Amino acid sequence: EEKNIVRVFRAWKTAHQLVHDRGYGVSQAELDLTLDQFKAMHCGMGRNLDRTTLSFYAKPSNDSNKGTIYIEFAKEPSVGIKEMRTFVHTLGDHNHKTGILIYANSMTPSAAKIIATVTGQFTIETFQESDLIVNITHHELVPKHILLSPDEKKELLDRYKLRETQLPRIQLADPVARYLGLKRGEVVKIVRRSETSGRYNSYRICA
Amino acid sequence: GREGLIDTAVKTAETGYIQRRLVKAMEDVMVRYDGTVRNAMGDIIQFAYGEDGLDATLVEYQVFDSLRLSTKQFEKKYRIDLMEDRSLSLYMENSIENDSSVQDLLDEEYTQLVADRELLCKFIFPKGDARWPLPVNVQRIIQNALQIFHLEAKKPTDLLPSDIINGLNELIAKLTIFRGSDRITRDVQNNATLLFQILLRSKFAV
Amino acid sequence: SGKAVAKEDRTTTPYMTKYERARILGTRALQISMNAPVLVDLEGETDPLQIAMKELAQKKIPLLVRRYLPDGSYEDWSVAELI
Amino acid sequence: KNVQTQIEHTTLSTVTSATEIHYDPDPQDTVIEEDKDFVEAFFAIPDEEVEENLYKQSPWLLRLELDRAKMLDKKLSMSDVAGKIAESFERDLFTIWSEDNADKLIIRCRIIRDDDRKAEDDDNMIEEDVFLKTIEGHMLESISLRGVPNITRVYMMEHKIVRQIEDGTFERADEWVLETDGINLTEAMTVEGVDATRTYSNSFVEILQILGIEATRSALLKELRNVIEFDGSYVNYRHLALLCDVMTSRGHLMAITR
Amino acid sequence: KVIIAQERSAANIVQVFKKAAPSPIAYVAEIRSALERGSRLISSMQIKLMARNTENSGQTIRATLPYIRSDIPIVIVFRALGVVPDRDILEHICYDPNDFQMLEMMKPCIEEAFVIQDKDIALDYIGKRGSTTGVTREKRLRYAHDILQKELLPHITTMEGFETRKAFFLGYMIHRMLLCALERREPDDRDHFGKKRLDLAGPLLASLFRMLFRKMTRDVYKYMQKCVETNREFNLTLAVKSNIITNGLRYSLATGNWGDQKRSMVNRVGVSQVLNRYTFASTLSHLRRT
């Protein structure tokens, strides 16, 4: 019965995990949280009544580059201008590089454009629920991609004397793009569990 | 009979249709002098010559002795020590040393550090199979080779454990296919032959 | 847009390719077939190509190969250089 | 089997015989046509609200014969079958089932409203019917149970999977596996089994939308091997490799039509 | 030259033949029968069923009635023969008891005639040949009657007072259909052969001859008009073109065409092959091809 409650516990194996991966800092405590250890930190009347303040922040270790990300659920279904533009000031108050907002189900067009517009350098990404609530990263068929600093980016275009176009592209709408949060132009090195003979390295950009 | 008599009437045409499909989308590709396969427009599709880097046509499925082996018997094939062992000295002939001063004792556990980082990975990459197609039949260059020179157990080795290990390191680093250095460009090469490599430390380990 | 590459800092493979051998021998063939200055003691042949092959074996044949890179740059190799 | 019967369409597949429409005035009307009736009377006797804020309204009794042909293969009670109907139609319907001690296992579903506001856009004069048949379409198509919308019947076959041991040797762990019969996934790993790290499909279309793009390449390679290998077939990992990279080298899945 | 057989349809079926499922329809009843009297054979039938769009409506059946024009629910045609009153119409299809199941499917069928509703309108909803004509009723009615006596099930009888005979057949046709959707039998098999007929050098040289004589009566008819005007005298072997079929068979049998070198372009390839006298054995195996 209380199925829709337990079903979100997995949104923290799809979230706090979503970090490094990237490069931010999360506690190895928040990664080994069992079924009940989750209900522990969160005090809900029942039983049921959960919600509350589901959504925290985190810091990175890459020192510079800036800045920081903010994980924030809802938990209000269907969203939603009455929860979007109103939950950005908060994002501008503690100052963050960017953050996440999840939902279920569907999101209105209106509350999708009137945002990423004055955002400037910052960014709104991206996911939702009843979708990516299980880290696909952990899949026989999914090789681990790792990001490339802009310095390393210039490497390829020399060693292989190429153009930022002549490389293997990746659609934005790719759960692994969204996952690492690729923006149009960055370049991602992936180490394929190929044969091959060997451990062959492929590279890709965004589009 | 009149069924496989029309099913033979098809494979006569269809088979041809599907053929042209591929061609008409792959003519584009070819291997550029850089050691990479690229599109008409230059859009590159592979960074090797086929991930391997080798010509399909010159290759012989081969076998990794060092894989489907019990750790218990693994040690009984490669590992060596001075602990109530020293059985090789019966072969060191002619010339033992004996044992000289350090160095040797040390080379023996360093060889296995890497012959061992290879036993764990794979697996961690390959399911369970062992037969895979590599370039240059090694299992054969040694026989025939024990035909050319012969010499049976009766003749012990005029070699030296400090040679076979140098032997490789000098002639794996002669197997280059991506040139050159050009630092970091030596990486694509170090592991564009990494598989072929674990063979040469498994059939030529001390 | 070419660029030319340093005869000192060459990248490509020192060995002569399946295809090149085939093109060189093809090229000198026509040359000699066209009464040309043959660069090795004539063994006593007749075939403008079987002769060119006598040359190749002794790496005493002119012609060089410009290997265009994707960049647009190239490299020049000497038959005596190659392998 | 917990899972075998935990990821199937399900819906109204146990009824298939079926839906009957009986007109019964007073909330205490029946007949039959069989036995039942008694159960209905017992439900009314408990007058725990009969009157309710409304009263006696619902002159459109509809009955449902649930086959015990699918009541055994799929762990389903009768209070569940009609326990989730009113979780998508408010209170427009009142279900009254019976215990498993019955010989037909039937469940009613009435309709009450008036004096309702009524309306709007679209009048209805002659005669309380159409609006009914329409409702059925949704009822029989919604939808309780671990029914992964779209996922039809499933199967289970022993797949000789090879594992490793702490020893060194490898062993053939003959584990069971389910063989889907159609889309889709996504809501397919959300299951308790399941297994997310290893679930697979035959529609690359989808694998690109829900895994990686790199993932989907491996999918091709695998799905082409399974086309030309069984049996005894000229395989080269190299050329297979190349076809794949060409397909998934520009993002989207570039097809190769005539 | 040797004429060669052919295997098209059969006619006079009595043939389920369904399909699916692009899909548009669902359950057909092709008939394409037609005299048969000694040449002619142009005409068809076919009738639909539909059973999709769970929103529209209740699975309703229709008809076509060549060669014009669209879809025409069934009740509309019974009401156009002599059986307008309901109930009686169902008597031609099914027979209670009954068996409402097979009948029920009618509900949606009848509803299509909830406006007919007699004999006037019926014939009315038939104004669509065509190439733009009419004006309007009276004329339309006349065309409807003509159709019922030539198009609507052209075999049986083409007289006048025989509309009660074609009233059952339709019931018989649609009787078959119902047997399949309800899943009471199986869709007839087009494999026959057993049901297809071979058109030898006879029925073949029929349809041609006819397709060359009807031009006779046309070429000469025009001559009369020119004679009666300015000319006259009467008639005589003055016309009757000689080179009309004499030359008009030479290059119609000689090649695979059926009316050359006229416009008749795509007119099914012969059927006219040269003999093939390689080996005696062969010669014979040729006079027996289709």
Q: In this structure, are A34 and A98 located in the same domain?
A: yes
Are B202 and B118 spatial neighbours (Cβ–Cβ below 8 Å)?
yes
Count of domains for chain C: 1
* Distance between CA atoms of residues B10 and B5, nearest Å: 9
- Among B180, B203, B177, CA closest to B52: B177
Are B60 and B134 spatial neighbours (Cβ–Cβ below 8 Å)?
yes
CATH code (residue C40): 3.90.940.10
Residue B195 has φ and ψ, to the nearest 5°, of -65, -55
Tokens 């009824």 sit on residue = D15
Q: Which residues of A touch D237 (CB under 8 A)?
A: 195
Q: Min CA distance, A37 vs chain D (Å)? A: 19
Domain that holds residue A97: 1-134
Helices (H), C1-83: 18-33, 50-57
Q: Which residues of C touch B180 (CB under 8 A)?
A: 11
Q: Tell me the fold of E12-189.
A: 3.90.1110
Q: Which residues of D touch E54 (CB under 8 A)?
A: 137
* Distance between CA atoms of residues D246 and D255, nearest Å: 10
Decide: C and B in contact? Rule: 3+ Cβ pairs under 8 Å.
Answer: yes
Q: In this structure, are A82 and A151 located in the same domain?
A: no
Which residue in B36, B132, B187 is closest to A195 by CB distance?
B132
Kindly report each contact of residues A44-52 with a partner whose C-beta sits within 8 Å and lies 24 or more positions away, as own/partner: A46/A2, A47/A2, A48/A2, A48/A5, A50/A5, A50/A8, A50/A75, A51/A75
Domain that holds residue C33: 1-83
CATH code (residue A184): 3.90.940.20
Q: Which residues of B touch A (CB under 8 A)?
A: 34, 36, 41-45, 47-48, 51-54, 125, 132, 134-135, 182, 184-185, 187-188, 191-196
Cis peptide bond N-terminal to D231, omega within 30: yes
**What is the residue type of D50?**
V
Chains near B (3 or more Cβ pairs under 8 Å)? A, C, D
* Distance between CA atoms of residues B17 and B22, nearest Å: 10
**Separation in Å, CA E65 to CA B42, D240, E107, E144, E151:** 62, 56, 22, 11, 7
Check CB contact under 8 Å for D238 and B69: no
CB within 8 A of E57, min separation 6: which ones? E108
Chains near D (3 or more Cβ pairs under 8 Å)? A, B, E
Check CB contact under 8 Å for B34 and A160: yes
Are D251 and A169 spatial neighbours (Cβ–Cβ below 8 Å)?
yes
- Among A94, A11, A14, A101, CA closest to A59: A94
Q: At what angle do helices B104-117 and B161-172 cross, to 10 degrees?
A: 40
* Number of C-beta neighbours around residue E22 at 10 A: 7
The three-point CA angle D190-D195-D196 to 5° equals 65
Whether chain B has a CB inside 8 Å of the CB on D249: the answer is yes
Helices (H), chain E: 75-78, 88-93, 100-104, 106-111, 120-124, 137-148, 166-181, 201-228, 247-253, 280-286
Residue D156 has φ and ψ, to the nearest 5°, of -140, 120
Are E81 and E166 spatial neighbours (Cβ–Cβ below 8 Å)?
yes
* Distance between CA atoms of residues D212 and D232, nearest Å: 31
* Distance between CA atoms of residues A58 and A27, nearest Å: 9
Which residue in A162, A167, A200 is closest to B48 by CB distance?
A200
Resolution attained, angstroms: 7.8
CB within 8 A of D250, min separation 6: which ones? A168, A169, B43
Which residue in D236, D239, D246 is closest to B25 by CB distance?
D246
Q: Min CA distance, A86 vs chain D (Å)? A: 30
Please give the residue of chain B at the shortest CA–CA distance from A202: B47
Chains near A (3 or more Cβ pairs under 8 Å)? B, C, D
Examine the fold and report which residue of A87, A103, A134 is the final residue of a domain before the chain moves on: A134
Q: Which residues of D touch B72 (CB under 8 A)?
A: 167-168
Which residue in D168, D243, D256 is closest to B69 by CB distance?
D168
* Number of C-beta neighbours around residue E11 at 10 A: 19
Provide the token pair at A171. 């659609």
CB within 8 A of D41, min separation 6: which ones? D28
Q: Min CA distance, D133 vs chain E (Å)? A: 9
Count of domains for chain A: 2
DSSP A142: B
Are E208 and E262 spatial neighbours (Cβ–Cβ below 8 Å)?
no
Burial E124-146 (b: 16+ CB within 10 A, else e): ebbbeeeeeeeeeeeebbebbee
Whether chain B has a CB inside 8 Å of the CB on A169: the answer is no
**What is the residue type of B140?**
R
Examine the fold and report which residue of A134, A167, A188 is the final residue of a domain before the chain moves on: A134
Are B194 and A199 spatial neighbours (Cβ–Cβ below 8 Å)?
yes
* Distance between CA atoms of residues E218 and E225, nearest Å: 11
- Among C21, C51, C19, CA closest to C36: C51
If DSSP codes are grouped into helix, strand and coil, which group holds residue D78? Answer: helix
Q: Which residues of A touch C11 (CB under 8 A)?
A: none
Check CB contact under 8 Å for C68 and B33: yes
* Distance between CA atoms of residues D240 and D238, nearest Å: 5
Tokens 């041809």 sit on residue = B16
Please give the residue of chain A at the shortest CA–CA distance from C72: A161
Find the length of chain B. Answer: 206
Examine the fold and report which residue of A134, A152, A177 is the final residue of a domain before the chain moves on: A134
Please give the residue of chain B at the shortest CA–CA distance from C14: B179
Q: In this structure, are A57 and A147 located in the same domain?
A: no
**Burial (CB count <10 Å: 0-12, 13-18, 19+), residue E60:** buried
